[model samples]
Target: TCIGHYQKCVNADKPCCSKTVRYGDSKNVRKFICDRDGEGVCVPFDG
Candidate 1:
């Protein structure tokens, strides 16, 4: 899953971003942001 997401980002020529996974309300559904290219990429998080 992680590899696939990274490949997509690279193909799209976008920077790898971060994702915030949380479950509470519909208003907050895993917010994501790009590094600088304004592209949101999903990567593995060390938890």
Candidate 2:
């Protein structure tokens, strides 16, 4: 399971999953990990 930036987070207390890079239509990847302990939301920073 994964979570998008500024989106709801999962059970992982360290960091959430998110895709940073993107392309026209077929390019996508999980470039970083976020967190959601207090805020309960995924942030744009490393864990």
Candidate 3:
């Protein structure tokens, strides 16, 4: 699930900084942004 989100972000021209899941979780139900060196920031998809 994390990988899927990562791919989606990448495909959408958004840089996927990282992916993580809570312990005992089987899938990444949420996604986060990669703020590397203050870069890779993303805005809302609907914007």
Tens digits of per-residue lDDT, candidate 3, 20-44, equal 4566745554445533344344422
lDDT of 2 by residue, 1-47 (tens): 55556665556654456655756877655544444466666766642
Q: What is the lDDT of residue 23 in candidate 1?
A: 66
Error of 2 at 18 (Å): 4.5
Predicted model with the maximum lDDT: 2
Lowest-sum lDDT 10-residue window in model 2: 28-37
For model 2 the local lDDT of residue 15 reads 48
Candidates by TM-score, descending order: 2, 1, 3
Q: All candidates' lDDT scores?
A: 0.41, 0.57, 0.40
Residue 28 lDDT in candidate 1:
34
RMSD for all candidates, in order, please.
7.7, 5.7, 8.7
Error of 3 at 35 (Å): 14
Residue 1's C-alpha lDDT in candidate 1?
A: 26
Query: How many clashes in each structure?
Result: 0, 2, 0
